[PDB]
Design a protein around this ligand. Structure first.
Ligand SMILES: CC(C)(COP(=O)(O)OP(=O)(O)OC[C@H]1O[C@@H](n2cnc3c(N)ncnc32)[C@H](O)[C@@H]1OP(=O)(O)O)[C@@H](O)C(=O)NCCC(=O)NCCSC(=O)CC[C@@H]1C(=O)CC[C@]2(C)C(=O)CC[C@@H]12
Ligand SMILES: CC(C)(COP(=O)(O)OP(=O)(O)OC[C@H]1O[C@@H](n2cnc3c(N)ncnc32)[C@H](O)[C@@H]1OP(=O)(O)O)[C@@H](O)C(=O)NCCC(=O)NCCSC(=O)CC[C@@H]1C(=O)CC[C@]2(C)C(=O)CC[C@@H]12
Ligand SMILES: [Cl-]
Ligand SMILES: [Cl-]
Ligand SMILES: [Cl-]
Ligand SMILES: [Cl-]
Ligand SMILES: [Cl-]
Ligand SMILES: [Cl-]
Ligand SMILES: [Cl-]
Ligand SMILES: [Cl-]
Lengths: 196, 196
């Protein structure tokens, strides 16, 4: 549930914090609020984390390490750029389904946090997934899977935005799973970028 | 530049306020900040607006009245659902190009403000444009322009999100106009929802 943690007590507390951060906002949530939510003294919460910033650092690193490990496995296991693009696209929806709070915290806070040295990895990961997308789009154009005159930066931003921003409306209690939503978004994107 | 105002002094001040709200955030901006920006006393700014909330009310009403008047003209002047959908889609990009601050303020604040009686029109307009999109998608499916099994609510949210969220990255100083970006986003959406 919390990407990059295990079922340890720390992991339990980070899950509770992530839910609070996602619901209330990071800057609206204190260590005291989290401790109250857990039924513990603040001092006991401070036996697991040095600060709230450290909690958010553990949440975002865990999420990004999980997501980029998925991306690595997808890139390595797919046989051509069309398959690869399909799997990379669906991973956004896997993230929304299973790590919803982390996705929301990323989208609400990562751009702001990225100027702090503690969060220098947010820009590193941003560049890395952009290069990943540009490379699969270029290879798909070069081999004739995708339409030849597509502007790959534009299509990258289209894909990034389309898929990830669905976290703002997707409700896990609703009738469709995130995978079903992703499949339908994918069908549209593929109709629009494949050749023929 | 400010949708729904004219080049009056009020209009000049609302433009300055909109830019500040979009840049700094509404709750981070005071009437004093705006007055300082304009070179006037707060008391003189209070000869044009009763409060900051009234400024935001004038900005969002002006924007929405402008946008929904565009939508009305597009619906009435297009000859079939495919043409109509093309024109409605491009209007998002016209809004981003020419009323950028208003779009940003909407996306940053309208959901929060909508629970206040002053902003009861935000939900009215939300329902209205959703019905507009669902109706054009249904008619296009019924007449064979669009793929027959599309989930129209899903495609509505896909279209709404795709296009409007590009305000978060689009820079007016950049090489592409918003119209060029819109045209390319449209080509992808049409490849993905048209029949054949
Ligand atoms: C405040 C709005 C109008 C809320 O939209 P909405 O009332 O559609 O709520 P939603 O959270 O987007 O979607 C909830 C629906 O998702 C459906 N849903 C949930 N999970 C499931 C599930 N698992 N299975 C199936 N179904 C499910 C759920 O059923 C539900 O259905 P409904 O009651 O209509 O039947 C909206 O602006 C917004 O912030 N929406 C959240 C999405 C969002 O932020 N996206 C980012 C880009 S979208 C955007 O900013 C457009 C602003 C656009 C613009 O900027 C200018 C002004 C505009 C044109 C307007 O007047 C209105 C729209 C305005
Ligand atoms: C903090 C990010 C990573 C910033 O992205 P980026 O560095 O691409 O900046 P940008 O503002 O999106 O795009 C700037 C580019 O637009 C281009 N541009 C500007 N205007 C023009 C013009 N007029 N002509 C042509 N070109 C132009 C401009 O040139 C420039 O180019 P570049 O320096 O790369 O060459 C991004 O998350 C974000 O907030 N981006 C703003 C768009 C946005 O909020 N979209 C909403 C949904 S996108 C989203 O939330 C994805 C989060 C996604 C996710 O949630 C989980 C974690 C993820 C996978 C990551 O690690 C990174 C992405 C993460
Ligand atoms: Cl994990
Ligand atoms: Cl890696
Ligand atoms: Cl393109
Ligand atoms: Cl499923
Ligand atoms: Cl106007
Ligand atoms: Cl109207
Ligand atoms: Cl569909
Ligand atoms: Cl142009």
């Amino acid at each position: 549930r919390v990407a990059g943690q295990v079922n340890s007590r720390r992991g339990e507390l980070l899950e509770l914090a992530a839910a609070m951060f996602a619901e209330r906002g990071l800057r609206a949530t204190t260590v005291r609020d989290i401790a109250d939510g857990a039924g513990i003294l603040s001092g006991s919460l401070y036996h697991h984390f040095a600060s709230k910033e450290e909690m958010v650092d553990e949440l975002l690193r865990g999420f990004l390490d999980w997501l980029f490990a998925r991306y690595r496995d997808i890139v390595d296991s797919t046989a051509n750029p069309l398959e690869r693009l399909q799997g990379l696209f669906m991973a956004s929806f896997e993230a929304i389904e299973h790590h919803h709070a982390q996705v929301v915290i990323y989208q609400d806070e990562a751009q702001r946090l990225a100027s702090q040295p503690r969060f220098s990895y947010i820009e590193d990961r941003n560049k890395q997934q952009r290069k990943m997308w540009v490379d699969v789009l270029n290879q798909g154009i070069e081999e004739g899977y995708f339409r030849p005159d597509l502007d790959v930066d534009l299509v990258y931003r289209f894909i990034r935005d389309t898929t990830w921003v669905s976290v703002r409306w997707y409700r896990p209690g609703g009738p469709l799973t995130a995978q079903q939503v992703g499949q339908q978004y994918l069908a549209i994107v593929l109709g629009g970028i494949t050749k023929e």
